[PDB]
Amino acid sequence: AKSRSSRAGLQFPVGRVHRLLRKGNYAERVGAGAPVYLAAVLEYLTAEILELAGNAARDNKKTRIIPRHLQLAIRNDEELNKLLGKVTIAQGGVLPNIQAVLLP
Amino acid sequence: KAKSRSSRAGLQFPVGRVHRLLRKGNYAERVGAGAPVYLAAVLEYLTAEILELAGNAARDNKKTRIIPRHLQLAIRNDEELNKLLGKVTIAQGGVLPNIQAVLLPK
Amino acid sequence: RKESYSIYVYKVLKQVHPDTGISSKAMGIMNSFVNDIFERIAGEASRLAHYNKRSTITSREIQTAVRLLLPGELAKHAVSEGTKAVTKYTSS
Amino acid sequence: RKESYSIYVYKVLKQVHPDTGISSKAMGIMNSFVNDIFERIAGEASRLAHYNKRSTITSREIQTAVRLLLPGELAKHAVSEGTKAVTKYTSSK
Amino acid sequence: RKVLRDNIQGITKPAIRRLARRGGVKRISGLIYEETRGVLKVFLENVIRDAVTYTEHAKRKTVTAMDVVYALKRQGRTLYGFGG
Amino acid sequence: KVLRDNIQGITKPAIRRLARRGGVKRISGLIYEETRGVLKVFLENVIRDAVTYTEHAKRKTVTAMDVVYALKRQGRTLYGFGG
Amino acid sequence: PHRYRPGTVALREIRRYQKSTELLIRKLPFQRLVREIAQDFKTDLRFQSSAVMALQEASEAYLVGLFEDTNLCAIHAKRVTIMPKDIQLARRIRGERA
Amino acid sequence: YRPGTVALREIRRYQKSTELLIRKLPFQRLVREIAQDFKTDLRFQSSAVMALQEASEAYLVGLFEDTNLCAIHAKRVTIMPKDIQLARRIRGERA
Ligand SMILES: [Cl-]
Ligand SMILES: [Cl-]
Ligand SMILES: [Cl-]
Ligand SMILES: [Cl-]
Ligand SMILES: [Cl-]
Ligand SMILES: [Cl-]
Ligand SMILES: [Cl-]
Ligand SMILES: [Cl-]
Ligand SMILES: [Cl-]
Ligand SMILES: [Cl-]
Ligand SMILES: [Cl-]
Ligand SMILES: [Cl-]
Ligand SMILES: [Cl-]
Ligand SMILES: [Cl-]
Ligand SMILES: [Cl-]
Ligand SMILES: [Cl-]
Ligand SMILES: [Cl-]
Ligand SMILES: [Cl-]
Ligand SMILES: [Cl-]
Ligand SMILES: [Cl-]
Ligand SMILES: [Cl-]
Ligand SMILES: [Cl-]
Ligand SMILES: [Cl-]
């Protein structure tokens, strides 16, 4: 562990997140722990969506995640669907779902 | 004694205080001198619009003092203020009198 | 601990309806109103400045914020009022 | 305009699904996601600092922000991840 | 420090009826009262959770009106009248 | 003067397929024109705001990010156009 | 003009309640509900009176708005009587149970 | 087959698909006309039109979902203008 990311055990870039927090007009100062915590949250939520999107890709015999699979992952997960309730995923389409009363 | 920024701008709302509140909020590294004059002028203008409408609604019910009810009648009877304030709740405001026509007698 | 504008809403009220008072509950609403609007405009002016890599909020960011945030005629009149005030101030 | 996190997204993908790729358009979606969530959390963290008249955003403001912004169950996982990272970072100091 | 329970039942039929009336409603099915209780409980639980989050963040033990106003903003509701 | 009515370039079949993607089994003939009105209001709202962004920056070309910002003003967050 | 059925009484009640601004849930019961709910999230929470009042103003405003939408949903189905299905439709479209 | 069967097969097909459903060039002409009413001499980046199209289609499809629920609520299978208008009213899109 040499970079701040490594020291935190993260892949996401602590140093960069720190600089973004400082340049963003968020407060007068940003403590050293903030970008570490924020990077870690970003990294974990990124892993959630990737886990789930990779699962959707595999269910359809694909080995490459496309926007469809991100949409399926989000919309089929109650928690991600709540988090991203006002998000539109370009080229994501919608979930296959027909109202029961409409079926023969 | 120095003439106030508000006086100089033709305003009642406080230009100097608005400038200060703009800086305290850390909205940007710098806040230009004209920003608070413009902002104060807008805040004053909206405030006049609403008070003008609410005062009329106070008068329309034989009242001489504006209460929340009057602010609510004024806002919701005005297409643009109702849209501006679409997600606002006025405490002790009530609702507009309005019954759906199908519920009334022929 | 939100900002009070009560003195100023009183003065405006006296210009528009010299006739009429305002209860303290009503003044509490008006104060919430002015704080809310200040925050919306300032927040949007801040985003505009950041989008455009500008270090400074100027009357141009406020004007654009006003146009974005306020509907229709309300925006046109607000923009005219802001512009007038800056014209008067600059002269005076 | 917006910040790119592609390299990092790719690394996370390699950990969770080592034999799965990701398309260019999907990467664009992921970069929008990261920027969105960054902005939400930082925004609320700034609000919290201002409410409390604190000049500094610390890890406490990020954590409260996460709890406010995320649904409860997902928030629990995020908070545990943020906390673990800060702990590791502070340890070998 | 008594253990409060079942207080949702304090939201009574006549209270719910008055609210529906203010909402312009002419006739109410018997099953609406229990539905409305369930809806209100969810709304309140959500708002109170966020309010208390602001309270604990500030290391207070007293929930203030501003904690509630912030909490509501967080649900996309702006409440006027409590900023004093 | 000139006829400016490009909203009628949005076809009945396009509207039907949107509805089908929306799970709709059957459509009244009166829905096509209703749809056109509601689309035109939507686009007018977003484009008004997107051009406000563009003008503010003293640009004459509307970018994808101008649109993304305009959509965020209407409470919609669009992913995929930040590159 | 109809004369003094449950409908005529209901309509006078709408006029009465749309005219007034007072809160319609009893205050002490509302307070006890608030305190019960808080009892999970934390032992030893106190509420400022005005915090309870804020919660009450917001809650009632919310219910009243939801009743308005509910009412429109009943009317759409050619009814005058609101039913749970009406509340549920309103909520789904509003995005509260989507 | 029955119009019902045809309609159901169409739902299945378009719910599986992600491609945009409005013709590209007619959508583009529509955006350009609307932009010209606000300011002449404006031009769109091509990705700007596409963002607008992705957003517009997403919006309409969501609106059709709610409209559909409103029809079913009235025991219809056929969506009507009143169904759109109820949905948009509850959404807060119209007064
Ligand atoms: Cl780093
Ligand atoms: Cl820190
Ligand atoms: Cl000052
Ligand atoms: Cl200052
Ligand atoms: Cl009025
Ligand atoms: Cl009426
Ligand atoms: Cl300036
Ligand atoms: Cl771990
Ligand atoms: Cl009861
Ligand atoms: Cl009844
Ligand atoms: Cl306030
Ligand atoms: Cl076609
Ligand atoms: Cl059809
Ligand atoms: Cl983006
Ligand atoms: Cl009361
Ligand atoms: Cl009590
Ligand atoms: Cl509220
Ligand atoms: Cl009925
Ligand atoms: Cl039912
Ligand atoms: Cl969108
Ligand atoms: Cl039918
Ligand atoms: Cl119809
Ligand atoms: Cl409509």
Q: What is the identity of the amino acid at D40?
A: R
Q: Which domains does chain C have, with CATH numbers?
A: 1-92 (1.10.20.10)
Instruction: Please check whether residue H81 touches B, CB under 8 A.
Output: no
Q: How far apart are CA A69 and CA G19, in angstroms?
A: 53
Q: What end-to-end distance do the CA atoms of chain G give, in Å?
A: 41
B99 CA to centre of ligand 6 in angstroms: 4
Query: Which residue of chain D comes nearest to A26, CA vs CA?
Result: D46
Helix axes G49-76, G84-94, angle to 10 degrees: 110
Instruction: Please check whether residue B28 touches D, CB under 8 A.
Output: no
Chains E and G touch (3+ CB pairs under 8 A): yes
Q: Which residues from chain A sit within 8 angstroms of residue F23, using beta carbons?
A: 97-99, 102
Measured CA angle at B29 (ends C55, A42), to 5 deg = 90
Query: Which structural domain range is residue H82 located in?
Result: 1-95
Measured CA angle at F27 (ends F26, F32), to 5 deg = 160
CB G4 within 8 A of CB B76: no
Q: Which of B22, A19, D1 is nearest to C43 (CA)?
A: B22
Name C19's Cβ contacts closer than 8 Å, sequence gap at least 6. Answer: B55, B64
* Site of tokens 């378009």: H14
CA distances A26 to C46, G89, G91, H11, Å, are 11, 40, 35, 46
At E70 the three-state DSSP class reads helix
Name A69's Cβ contacts closer than 8 Å, sequence gap at least 6. Answer: A53, A54, A56, A57, A60, A62, D26
Ramachandran region of residue F75, left (φ > 0), alpha (ψ -120 to 50) or beta? left
Task: Compute the nearest-CA separation of B88 from chain E (Å).
Answer: 5
DSSP annotation of B1: -
Nearest to H72 among A90, A94, A99 (CB): A99
Tokens of H75: 């025991």
- Beta-bridge partner residues of B27: none
Query: Which structural domain range is residue F52 located in?
Result: 1-83
C87 CA to centre of ligand 21 in angstroms: 62
Instruction: Please check whether residue H68 touches A, CB under 8 A.
Output: yes
CB B68 within 8 A of CB C25: yes
Alpha carbon dihedral D45, D51, D55, D56, in 10-degree steps, equals -30
**Alpha-carbon G98 to chain mean position:** 20
- Other beta carbons within 10 angstroms of residue A73's beta carbon come to 24
Point out the ligand nearest to the CA of residue E13: 9
Q: Which residues from chain H sit within 8 angstroms of residue A95, using beta carbons?
A: 15
The residue among D50, D51, D53 with the most chain E CBs within 10 A of its CB, best to mutate, is D51
Tokens of H9: 């097969």
Q: How far apart are CA H49 and CA H32, in angstroms?
A: 9
At G56 the three-state DSSP class reads helix
SS (H, E, C) B14-66: CHHHHHHHHHHCCCCCEECCHHHHHHHHHHHHHHHHHHHHHHHHHHHCCCCEE
Tokens of H36: 């010209």
Query: Which structural domain range is residue B79 located in?
Result: 1-106
Q: Domain holding E37: CATH number?
A: 1.10.20.10
* Overall number of domains in chain A: 1
CB C88 within 8 A of CB B10: yes
Neighbours of chain F (3+ CB pairs under 8 A): A, C, D, H
Q: How far apart are CA A39 and CA A28, in angstroms?
A: 20
CB H88 within 8 A of CB H70: no
Q: Domain holding H25: CATH number?
A: 1.10.20.10
Q: Domain holding B45: CATH number?
A: 1.10.20.10
Q: Which residues from chain E sit within 8 angstroms of residue D60, using beta carbons?
A: 57
For residues D34-58, b (16+ Cβ closer than 10 Å) or e, as one string?
A: bbbbbbbbbebbbbbbebeebeebb
Q: What is the identity of the amino acid at G84?
A: P
* Overall number of domains in chain F: 1
